[PDB]
Amino acid sequence: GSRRYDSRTTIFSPEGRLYQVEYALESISHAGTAIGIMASDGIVLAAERKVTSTLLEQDTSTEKLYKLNDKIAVAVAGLTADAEILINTARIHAQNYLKTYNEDIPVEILVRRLSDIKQGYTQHGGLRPFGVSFIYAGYDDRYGYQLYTSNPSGNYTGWKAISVGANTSAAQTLLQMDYKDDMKVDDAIELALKTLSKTTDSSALTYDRLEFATIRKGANDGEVYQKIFKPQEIKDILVKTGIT
Amino acid sequence: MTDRYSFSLTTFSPSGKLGQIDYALTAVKQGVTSLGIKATNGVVIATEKKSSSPLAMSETLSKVSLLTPDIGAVYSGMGPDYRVLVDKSRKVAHTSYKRIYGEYPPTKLLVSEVAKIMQEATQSGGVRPFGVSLLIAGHDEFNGFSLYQVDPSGSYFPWKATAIGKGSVAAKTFLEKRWNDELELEDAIHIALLTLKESVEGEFNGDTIELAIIGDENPDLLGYTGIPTDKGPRFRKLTSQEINDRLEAL
Amino acid sequence: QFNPYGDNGGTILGIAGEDFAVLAGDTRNITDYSINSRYEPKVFDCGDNIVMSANGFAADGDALVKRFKNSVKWYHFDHNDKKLSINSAARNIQHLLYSRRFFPYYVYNIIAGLDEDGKGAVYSFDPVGSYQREQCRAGGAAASLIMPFLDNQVNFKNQYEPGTNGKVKKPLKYLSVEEVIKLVRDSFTSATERHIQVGDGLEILIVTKDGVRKEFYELKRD
Amino acid sequence: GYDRALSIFSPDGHIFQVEYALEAVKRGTCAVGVKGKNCVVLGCERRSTLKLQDTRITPSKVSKIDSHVVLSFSGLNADSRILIEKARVEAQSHRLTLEDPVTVEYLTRYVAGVQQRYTQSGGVRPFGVSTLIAGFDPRDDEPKLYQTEPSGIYSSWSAQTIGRNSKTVREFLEKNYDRKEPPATVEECVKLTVRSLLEVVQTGAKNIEITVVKPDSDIVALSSEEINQYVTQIEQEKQE
Amino acid sequence: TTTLAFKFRHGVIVAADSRATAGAYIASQTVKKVIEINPYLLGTMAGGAADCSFWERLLARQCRIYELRNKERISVAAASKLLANMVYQYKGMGLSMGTMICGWDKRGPGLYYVDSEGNRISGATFSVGSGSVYAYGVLDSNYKWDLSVEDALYLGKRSILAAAHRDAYSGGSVNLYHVTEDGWIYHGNHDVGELFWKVKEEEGSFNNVIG
Amino acid sequence: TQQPIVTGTSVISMKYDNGVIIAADNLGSYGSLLRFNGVERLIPVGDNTVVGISGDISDMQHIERLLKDLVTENAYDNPLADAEEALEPSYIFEYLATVMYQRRSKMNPLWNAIIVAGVQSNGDQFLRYVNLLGVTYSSPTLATGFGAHMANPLLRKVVDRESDIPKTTVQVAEEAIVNAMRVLYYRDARSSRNFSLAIIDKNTGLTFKKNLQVENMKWDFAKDIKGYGTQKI
Amino acid sequence: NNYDGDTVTFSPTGRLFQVEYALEAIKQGSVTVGLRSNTHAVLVALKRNADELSSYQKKIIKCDEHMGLSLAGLAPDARVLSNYLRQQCNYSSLVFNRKLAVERAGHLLCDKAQKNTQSYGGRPYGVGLLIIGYDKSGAHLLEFQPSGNVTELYGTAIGARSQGAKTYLERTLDTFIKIDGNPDELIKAGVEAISQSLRDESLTVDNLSIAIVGKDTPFTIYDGEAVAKYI
Amino acid sequence: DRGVSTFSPEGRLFQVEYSLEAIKLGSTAIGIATKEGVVLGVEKRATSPLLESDSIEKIVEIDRHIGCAMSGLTADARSMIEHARTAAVTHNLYYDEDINVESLTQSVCDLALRFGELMSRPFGVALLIAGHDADDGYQLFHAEPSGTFYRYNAKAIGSGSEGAQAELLNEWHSSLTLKEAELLVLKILKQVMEEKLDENNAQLSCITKQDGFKIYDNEKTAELIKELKEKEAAE
Numbered sequence A: 001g002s003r004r005y006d007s008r009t010t011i012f013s014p015e016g017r018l019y020q021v022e023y024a025l026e027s028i029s030h031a032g033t034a035i036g037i038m039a040s041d042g043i044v045l046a047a048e049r050k051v052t053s054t055l056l057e058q059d060t061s062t063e064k065l066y067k068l069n070d071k072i073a074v075a076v077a078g079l080t081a082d083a084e085i086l087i088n089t090a091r092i093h094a095q096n097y098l099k100t101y102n103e104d105i106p107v108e109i110l111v112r113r114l115s116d117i118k119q120g121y122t123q124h125g126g127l128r129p130f131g132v133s134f135i136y137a138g139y140d141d142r143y144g145y146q147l148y149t150s151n152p153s154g155n156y157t158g159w160k161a162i163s164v165g166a167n168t169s170a171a172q173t174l175l176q177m178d179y180k181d182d183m184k185v186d187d188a189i190e191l192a193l194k195t196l197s198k199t200t201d202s203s204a205l206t207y208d209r210l211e212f213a214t215i216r217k218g219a220n221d222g223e224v225y226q227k228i229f230k231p232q233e234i235k236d237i238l239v240k241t242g243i244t
Numbered sequence B: 001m002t003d004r005y006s007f008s009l010t011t012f013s014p015s016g017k018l019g020q021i022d023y024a025l026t027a028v029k030q031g032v033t034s035l036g037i038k039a040t041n042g043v044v045i046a047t048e049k050k051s052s053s054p055l056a057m058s059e060t061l062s063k064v065s066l067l068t069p070d071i072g073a074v075y076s077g078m079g080p081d082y083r084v085l086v087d088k089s090r091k092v093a094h095t096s097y098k099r100i101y102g103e104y105p106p107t108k109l110l111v112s113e114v115a116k117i118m119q120e121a122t123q124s125g126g127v128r129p130f131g132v133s134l135l136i137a138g139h140d141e142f143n144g145f146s147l148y149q150v151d152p153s154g155s156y157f158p159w160k161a162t163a164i165g166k167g168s169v170a171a172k173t174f175l176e177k178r179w180n181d182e183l184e185l186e187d188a189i190h191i192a193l194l195t196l197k198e199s200v201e202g203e204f205n206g207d208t209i210e211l212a213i214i215g216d217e218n219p220d221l222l223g224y225t226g227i228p229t230d231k232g233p234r235f236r237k238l239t240s241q242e243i244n245d246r247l248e249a250l
Numbered sequence C: 001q002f003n004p005y006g007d008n009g010g011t012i013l014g015i016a017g018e019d020f021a022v023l024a025g026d027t028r029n030i031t032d033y034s035i036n037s038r039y040e041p042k043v044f045d046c047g048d049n050i051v052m053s054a055n056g057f058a059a060d061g062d063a064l065v066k067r068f069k070n071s072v073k074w075y076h077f078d079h080n081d082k083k084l085s086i087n088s089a090a091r092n093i094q095h096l097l098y099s100r101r102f103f104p105y106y107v108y109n110i111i112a113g114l115d116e117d118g119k120g121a122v123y124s125f126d127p128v129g130s131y132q133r134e135q136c137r138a139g140g141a142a143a144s145l146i147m148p149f150l151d152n153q154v155n156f157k158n159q160y161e162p163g164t165n166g167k168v169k170k171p172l173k174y175l176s177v178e179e180v181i182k183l184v185r186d187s188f189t190s191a192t193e194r195h196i197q198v199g200d201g202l203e204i205l206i207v208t209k210d211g212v213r214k215e216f217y218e219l220k221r222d
Numbered sequence D: 001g002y003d004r005a006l007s008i009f010s011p012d013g014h015i016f017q018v019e020y021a022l023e024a025v026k027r028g029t030c031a032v033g034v035k036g037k038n039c040v041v042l043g044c045e046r047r048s049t050l051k052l053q054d055t056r057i058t059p060s061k062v063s064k065i066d067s068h069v070v071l072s073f074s075g076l077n078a079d080s081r082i083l084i085e086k087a088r089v090e091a092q093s094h095r096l097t098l099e100d101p102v103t104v105e106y107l108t109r110y111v112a113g114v115q116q117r118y119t120q121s122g123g124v125r126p127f128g129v130s131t132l133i134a135g136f137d138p139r140d141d142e143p144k145l146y147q148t149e150p151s152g153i154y155s156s157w158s159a160q161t162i163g164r165n166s167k168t169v170r171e172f173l174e175k176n177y178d179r180k181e182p183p184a185t186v187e188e189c190v191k192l193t194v195r196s197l198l199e200v201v202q203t204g205a206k207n208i209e210i211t212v213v214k215p216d217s218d219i220v221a222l223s224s225e226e227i228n229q230y231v232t233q234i235e236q237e238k239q240e
Numbered sequence E: 001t002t003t004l005a006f007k008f009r010h011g012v013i014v015a016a017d018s019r020a021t022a023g024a025y026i027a028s029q030t031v032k033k034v035i036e037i038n039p040y041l042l043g044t045m046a047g048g049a050a051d052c053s054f055w056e057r058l059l060a061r062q063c064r065i066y067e068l069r070n071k072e073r074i075s076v077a078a079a080s081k082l083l084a085n086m087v088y089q090y091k092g093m094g095l096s097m098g099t100m101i102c103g104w105d106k107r108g109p110g111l112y113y114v115d116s117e118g119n120r121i122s123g124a125t126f127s128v129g130s131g132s133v134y135a136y137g138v139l140d141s142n143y144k145w146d147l148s149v150e151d152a153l154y155l156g157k158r159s160i161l162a163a164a165h166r167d168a169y170s171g172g173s174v175n176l177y178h179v180t181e182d183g184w185i186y187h188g189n190h191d192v193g194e195l196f197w198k199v200k201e202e203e204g205s206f207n208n209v210i211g
Numbered sequence F: 001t002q003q004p005i006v007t008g009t010s011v012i013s014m015k016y017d018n019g020v021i022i023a024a025d026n027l028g029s030y031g032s033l034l035r036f037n038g039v040e041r042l043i044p045v046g047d048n049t050v051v052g053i054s055g056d057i058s059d060m061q062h063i064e065r066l067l068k069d070l071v072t073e074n075a076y077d078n079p080l081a082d083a084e085e086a087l088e089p090s091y092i093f094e095y096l097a098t099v100m101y102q103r104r105s106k107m108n109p110l111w112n113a114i115i116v117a118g119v120q121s122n123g124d125q126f127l128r129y130v131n132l133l134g135v136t137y138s139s140p141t142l143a144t145g146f147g148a149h150m151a152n153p154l155l156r157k158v159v160d161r162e163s164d165i166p167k168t169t170v171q172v173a174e175e176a177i178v179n180a181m182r183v184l185y186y187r188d189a190r191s192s193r194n195f196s197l198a199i200i201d202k203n204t205g206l207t208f209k210k211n212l213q214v215e216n217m218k219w220d221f222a223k224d225i226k227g228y229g230t231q232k233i
Numbered sequence G: 001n002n003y004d005g006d007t008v009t010f011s012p013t014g015r016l017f018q019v020e021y022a023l024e025a026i027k028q029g030s031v032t033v034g035l036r037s038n039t040h041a042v043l044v045a046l047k048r049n050a051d052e053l054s055s056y057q058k059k060i061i062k063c064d065e066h067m068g069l070s071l072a073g074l075a076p077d078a079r080v081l082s083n084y085l086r087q088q089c090n091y092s093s094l095v096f097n098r099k100l101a102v103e104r105a106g107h108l109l110c111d112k113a114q115k116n117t118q119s120y121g122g123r124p125y126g127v128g129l130l131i132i133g134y135d136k137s138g139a140h141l142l143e144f145q146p147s148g149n150v151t152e153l154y155g156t157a158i159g160a161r162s163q164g165a166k167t168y169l170e171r172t173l174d175t176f177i178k179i180d181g182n183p184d185e186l187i188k189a190g191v192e193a194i195s196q197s198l199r200d201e202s203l204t205v206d207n208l209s210i211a212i213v214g215k216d217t218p219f220t221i222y223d224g225e226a227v228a229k230y231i
Numbered sequence H: 001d002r003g004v005s006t007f008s009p010e011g012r013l014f015q016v017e018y019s020l021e022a023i024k025l026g027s028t029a030i031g032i033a034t035k036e037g038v039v040l041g042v043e044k045r046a047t048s049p050l051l052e053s054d055s056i057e058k059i060v061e062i063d064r065h066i067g068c069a070m071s072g073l074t075a076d077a078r079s080m081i082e083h084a085r086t087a088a089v090t091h092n093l094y095y096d097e098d099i100n101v102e103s104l105t106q107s108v109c110d111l112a113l114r115f116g117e118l119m120s121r122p123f124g125v126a127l128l129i130a131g132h133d134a135d136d137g138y139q140l141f142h143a144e145p146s147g148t149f150y151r152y153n154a155k156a157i158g159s160g161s162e163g164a165q166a167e168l169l170n171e172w173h174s175s176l177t178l179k180e181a182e183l184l185v186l187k188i189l190k191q192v193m194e195e196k197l198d199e200n201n202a203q204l205s206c207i208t209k210q211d212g213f214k215i216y217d218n219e220k221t222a223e224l225i226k227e228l229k230e231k232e233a234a235e
């Protein structure tokens, strides 16, 4: 019967690893690098678009940075199509919470929910897991500014600074070196771009090969603003920090 | 009986590759060339009508398809897969949008829905991926004109101009030299015909080429008068004669 | 509007002795003012020395008996031909009745046999499963005519010993099978006189350690 | 639905998927449980390969199932969340239907039953998780400490460890822990728990987590400085 | 029917009549309205005979499984709650039950009132049935915590008698139970006909009646 | 739950020494309208059973099809279908009685009253009744609807109890049935003159008589009846 | 070889190996004999024990007052199939007031076993059955194979060493068929038939199991000192 | 791979045969039936000295008149015990009586072969079911994952089973007392166990008509162990 053709996606190896999860992580390691840095007065999200073309319409393009709600955003590393499935689920979950409790969803609760969905695909159903790793950047009134990551295993952890995708080993070393606790957003912006500029596989880091976003309390009085940077605005911040 | 294939047929290999998606992209590569170019006041999509037999009436086989009055689509790869995707794309435009908001979806969101259908064929049980890449050209009020590519993985990207299928690498190079941000629609049609001639071997005329545009509103194609706000479809398929007229000034 | 219930009349009577038990019932079947049958059996040998009668709506009564007979059959299959005790049958019948709590069997059920000490046993049920063991019980159309007579002549109620004047009761001496059948026949002859749904014939089933025996007696056919 | 039998017997009478789930537990960070005379202490290892971590928001290793019971684990982190959620739901369901909080033995029996169910159900793999469940029964002052594993077997322990290098810390506990006279105070119990982790951990900085559970729903997590004082005292006595 | 139960120093007394009625007709006079759930747990029956009987036997099985699983006797509170949740499923469907779950557990003597309407109430004194209103008068006036077992058994018996006399749908005989920490003890069947005359003479009550 | 539309009236029957007789008129009434005049309400099953049906005709036609299908199904993988393992009156009845009671228990009854008349393998007479409620009974005489009120009294004068059955011949029994059908034609407003009669004998087998008429009717005394009390002319 | 992984796969010569392997389980089972006359039908079964402390596994199962069988192979599969027969016999009685024909009982078993040989996921039954009964056409004996094949016979035997008893019955055919109105002599012929399949061990009091059904004889099973008469 | 419900060429179910191998790895459990009662005993086999041995529950009550000992993958037994307890209590609900030991055993064995592609695999545990009823008296059954159950006068399951069974072959007779059976289980357990038998690593239990199913205290078993040592030293 059909058993003959079943790959058995949800089994342990003799060493106690999940085959498909490990191979999904291998896929993600070839994806464009995404970096998240948390500061005292905000969060930075930086990400590298993969070998683009001159004929790609950049200003209407979005492959890395997505908005989950007004307070929370995500950087993607892996299969974009798989990520959009999860992103829409997270957007719905955030709205369900808001409808139920009349309060914006705490960041961790949203992260746990998505991570639980990923976990399910590794334990039951016989389907391949989602080949996606997220960096969650968000704010709530309990813990303030928060950075999380999740991977196909469905395991998630909190960070002060973190990278996913390609060259994370090199990127994490550079972040661990220059990061300090009393750091500010403007400094974190500079750190993120400098780290991408050194880890990138491209010849030079340009505006057309980047997606950038900040979450700042730099909004008029006690409130939070999400800024998805435009192509011209990425070009300006590259000149300001002294990369181009 | 029962469908007992409740498991994925597309899985990650040790190298991190999704084999069936790669193989689907290979099928797209073998397919006939199709392209899309975006102008300031319009979009053009074009392809070759590769007739399987001269006894076959190639007019009955439509490679360029209307999805909504302001959105059109063309493909490269497996024709039957494209035909069912067009049926589903047309339906989802109504069920997931028009029946809710009372208006047709913007290009990017219809593309998003088509992409979702193609992603699910890449993860769901007992199915293979669609063996096609789509080029979807369209217009809407708040985003203006736009051109999107959709791949077997479900990934989609917006383009100023592009090409897919047999001679895509050469065609994309040709488009890079000719494309600028000040092109009028007629200039884009002219460039589309030049680009397409390079990939075609045999006859090159209005009967062997299929070409459609997203441009100005066509009140003559609306089918009724009396409502000022309803000005007609922006999608228009060029006739055999209309193509031949532009081949003389080529 | 369709009424799924009916009333087939009839009356039944169970009396328990010291080492025996009887279950009697008239053989008349009726609808409204018409007679369907002058002889339509209403008391059945269900097996394992148990007799049973479901009186009221005959279609529901026939179904219940049919199900209990079936329950006895499967009790043997599942438990190595073990004999179903009268107390175990009663509990089983409760669950048959309550399984239709929201569309009841419109019947009053009585079973009779011998308990595990060999003594006579009678159990009576309400239409939805409430059951109780008793020494004497009449059910059906003329139940209210017969029961007071049995309280007086079986349990010696309101009867005292002459000379004492209400100070000392009549002692509860057990009855023989011959004395019991007399009370049964007089009960049904009296009920036949004053109740229009009772008559035609009387069929009595007697249960002893030796088995199940039958006795039939005619009644007035008016 | 996906019905495939993933956990099955092999010719030698082994269920490899359950045994491979134990290998996932062996890979997991070390967890230790020690019960004193009037308390239970749960110690947990934090691997220092991950720095630049935000310790405020990172999921803690010890999880409260109810106000009087806690659960720590070793193995797949994502798998542990599913067991913890189920346990928490059952704890409230028990209070709701029986008007008493769960006993530690009951909660353990439930969690172990869930684990077992995933070893003979179609289309699912076993949990790659072993748990240590500790606490005090309602209106009781006797300490409780149980362990579970992927196969679904569970048992009570005077002291126990699970995870990577658990063989070493179990060796330490077997010679140091006396049944006739267990850790009489909280200090003695915590000290023994820290000592046991210091055999394996590496550095005694932010790598050791300690959670003390006392009777009548008195649960508290020690801070870095409080634990660091134990690490200091232990090594100063060792220099002799 | 008339049933009652009350907690006191030395446990809980449980009493009930034995009459069953089908309209004005007295169907039975020997019915058992107290139910034996376990050696330490009793349940009363009022309203639907079948309903009360079926669901409390269902509860008893539920309680027995609990003992096997947990190696521990169920509490009075948990038992009453299992019943309450069971009948709550069928609310508005036509069930008719008024019960009392009486027992001794780790918390001492326990007494819960449970009905088909959905009420579940802990209390020291309850009476349910058509004759409850007559029984309450005797209970409330004579009930104390410091009551002897002899006096407590009489109170529960005398209270049923009051109701059996006045209420047309109550009578027959009195069944008595005493629940201790060592389990429940049956204290006999007492015919109301004989009991009435005895109590009249010894107590002096019921002066209006002639005998 | 429904209401009957097109209906059939009385079915009457009785036992005699060697078999059973059953009869029913050929009318299908539509309320007070005597709509259909050629309706057969006696339906033979094999050569040993006749099922007589009263009540709703659409439900009758449904039952008629169940019985026709029952014969077909019994012959499947049955070499003794025309011999030892042929359908018995008791098998046919119990099947119908099962269906009737099941349908009433779903509150969607077959609005009929049925009499199954036949002779068993051992020569024993079979005569049993079943209706929309699943109520069953047997008696030496059986009748449905108006027949229960008017025919049974006449047939019970011939066979009052079980011991009168051997004393009753086929000529006497048929005579009684034919007289009962005349009385029903006098007194039942939903009856017809035309009827069918079936005899199932253990010796001579199944005799099915069609197109029978009520005859020897008394109407002459009507000429003398004038007015409603005081009128003389 | 490559075509025995499941029941849904024919081999290149048109064989179903999983069914043939299920057939093999019957040959490993203990011997049981069936035979009949015109008035009665008899089952004789050699029961098997695990060891001296153990009981002797029961081989004969009653289905109705007029029908029953003996098993050889997987006992749980016999419990499932006999339960199905009990239900079918019971459906026939409750609905049609009719005792189920033995031939029709065989047709129902055939069809139930067949479904397990043509569908993926399931497995064939691993047991052989000998059904006896007395119905309206007299005494009957059936042999059931889990391939689905059911056969009506005068006599037969299944299980280990069953060929010896089957040969004996083939010789005795003309004799035992005539044993009418004599249950003890028909059982004697059955006990003598099963004896031809014995090696080393002999028929003891707790080893032998006999069952009979007939004209005025309900299906009854004889075990223990009740069969000492026939030893 | 291959089906879960597949027959081998010898006519055996692969998975059932493989589960029997898992049971051979399990700790020893012994049962002896007498006219005065049935005794059940088990090897606890703690993996470490820190493990509180009294929490090891390998002897289990099903009803007041039925007990049960297990050997093999003991986690698999929990749902079998749960079903058995439910079956026993449910029958008491439907029939107002104790359930026959054989009928209870048959109910447990009906679960055994409910596996395929229902549960995904057979049970990896064997059960000794001991009890008493009025019809057949004191009984001992051995329930396997094949769905088969044999009645036994005496039976041993687990790692030291064939060695223990041979010993039970010689020692058992129809006139054994309860005390004699208790010492006999302790004797044979001590013989097949790796570690030295004491009250902490071994557990006794019995079922009598009067007192019902009882698990023995460690203090009570300790005296029976001391009584065993002295009687072996007596000759």
Ligand SMILES: *[C@@]([C])([C][O])[C@](*)(=O)[C]([C]C1=[C][C]=[C][C]=[C]1)[N]C(=O)[C]([C]C1=[C][N]C2=C1[C]=[C][C]=[C]2)[N]C(=O)[C]([C])[N]C(=O)C1=C([C])C2=C([C]1)[C]=[C][C]=[C]2
Binding pocket: C104, C106, C126, C127, C128, C130, E001, E002, E019, E020, E021, E022, E023, E027, E031, E032, E033, E045, E046, E047, E048, E049, E050, E052, E096, E129, E130, E169, E170
């Ligand atoms: C008092 C006598 C009256 O409240 C007392 O409550 C007793 C309680 C009791 C009796 C026997 C056993 C245990 C407890 N109650 C009865 O005697 C009731 C009276 C009653 C009938 N319906 C009802 C009652 C009380 C309160 C609500 C609803 N008797 C019964 O329950 C019995 C006799 N059942 C029936 O009479 C019938 C039922 C049930 C039923 C009938 C009659 C007909 C059709 C379907 C069901």
Ligand SMILES: [Mg+2]
Binding pocket: B117, B118, B119, B121, B122, B128, B129, B130, B131, B151, B152, B153, B154
């Ligand atoms: Mg696709």
Ligand SMILES: [Mg+2]
Binding pocket: C221, C222
């Ligand atoms: Mg009259």
Ligand SMILES: [Mg+2]
Binding pocket: E081, E082, E083, E085, E086
């Ligand atoms: Mg409940």
